[PDB]
Structure formats: structure tokens, C-alpha cells
DNA sequence: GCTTTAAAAGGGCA
DNA sequence: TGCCCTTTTAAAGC
């Protein structure tokens, strides 16, 4: 972190194999944290309050959980799911745990010129304040997202690890600062 | 409460 | 096919 700002994590998304046909409307009924209708949406929805998160649950084992502010919470989150899941009778594993996606956030405390930042990186900007305030920047590599604000303010998205979103933000740091608002 | 970004999982449907 | 269905989270501006 050279630029000596470390992006703080937001939201994880990971997911894992319960390995295990699972019956959503037995488990929607003995669980308390669930809630479930097939005709809006194929998984059971279920919430814990530590570490904070929500966890989509499908008939074929395989699970989503969302929410968490690290990965080894998530993770942490997962198991605790697989467990709730165990405990209403199915053989659930923990197959294949995988962090699918990272969100991260920072601040680099000076106004940003959007417009003259998007000129000089057309390849990979997107600024339509109209429909949107923040500045959407595709960096390649690493293959990141950046929202980048008039306010200094960041959100980096689209990580597996957090090596990435530091990496970008590292990448875009000077390139904020050459579009710094005077 | 909406807009935008990323990602995963599944059923529905044109 | 392809893509929305839902869920999470930050941000600024409407």
C-alpha cells in the first residue's frame, strides 16, 4: 500500500457445496431464519445475525452467502448455514468453499475531476452523470471495477482476492491524483 | 428509495 | 440461448 490508504471490505460473496439434494420446503418450515416462495425465486433465504449475513440455499446443495466483511467471516458464515442445514437431518459437507466476489471501499480525502479523468482513459472509463454520479472504470488488470466519485470517495469491486483490490486501487492512485481537483 | 458495479446460485420463459 | 429471477455492499445524486 504505497499510497498508504488501505481500502476497507464491504461485502463478500462466497459459495460452497452442501453436497446434498437438500428439500427447501422442509427446511423453510423447521428453520426460523428462513423465508421461501419457489414462484419468486429458486433458493431458501436465511439470515444469522454473527457475522452478519444472508445465505441462499438451493435444492442442489450448493449455497451463496453474502454480506460478510471479510473472507475468513464468510467463510466463518458458510459453515455456520451448513450446520443449521445439518441440523434439520441432511448429510451436509462443505465442499469446494469459494470466495466469488470481494467489495471494497476507500477514501482518498481530495476531489476527483470525473470528466477529465474518463477523457484521457476512454478505454476503460464510462461517465454518464445523468444516470449515474460515479465514474465506472473497467481496469484490465487486475480485471477490477472502480466507481470512482467526485468526492475522492472509491468502491472496488469484482475481486476473488483481496490482493486485487488493493492492487487496483494502488494502480488508479496516481491516476486519481493527476485528475485531483484544485 | 432509486440509479450503477461485481459475483454466485436456480427456475422460468421467449 | 440469454438472461432475469434474488441477495449483499459501498458510493453521490436524484
Given at each position: 500500500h504505497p499510497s498508504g490508504i488501505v481500502?476497507?471490505?464491504?461485502?463478500?460473496?462466497?459459495?460452497?457445496?452442501?453436497?446434498?439434494?437438500?428439500?427447501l420446503k422442509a427446511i423453510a418450515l423447521q428453520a426460523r431464519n428462513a423465508e421461501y416462495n419457489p414462484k419468486r425465486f429458486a433458493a431458501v433465504i436465511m439470515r444469522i445475525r454473527e457475522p452478519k449475513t444472508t445465505a441462499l440455499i438451493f435444492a442442489s446443495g450448493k449455497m451463496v452467502c453474502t454480506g460478510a466483511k471479510s473472507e475468513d467471516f464468510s467463510k466463518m458464515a458458510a459453515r455456520k448455514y451448513?450446520?443449521?442445514v445439518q441440523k434439520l437431518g441432511f448429510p451436509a459437507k462443505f465442499k469446494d468453499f469459494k470466495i466469488q466476489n470481494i467489495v471494497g471501499s476507500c477514501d482518498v480525502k481530495f476531489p476527483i475531476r470525473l470528466e477529465?479523468?474518463?477523457?484521457?482513459?476512454?478505454?476503460?472509463?464510462?461517465?454518464?452523470?445523468?444516470?449515474?454520479?460515479?465514474?465506472?472504470?473497467?481496469?484490465?488488470?487486475?480485471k477490477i471495477v472502480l466507481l470512482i466519485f467526485v468526492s475522492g470517495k472509491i468502491v472496488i469491486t469484482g475481486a476473488k482476492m483481496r490482493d486485487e483490490t488493493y492492487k487496483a486501487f494502488e494502480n488508479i492512485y496516481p491516476v486519481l491524483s493527476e485528475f485531483r481537483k484544485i
Open positions: 481500502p476497507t471490505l464491504q461485502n463478500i460473496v462466497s459459495t460452497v457445496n452442501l453436497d446434498c439434494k437438500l428439500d451448513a450446520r443449521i477529465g479523468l474518463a477523457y484521457s482513459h476512454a478505454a476503460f472509463s464510462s461517465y454518464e452523470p445523468e444516470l449515474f454520479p460515479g465514474l465506472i472504470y473497467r481496469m484490465k488488470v487486475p
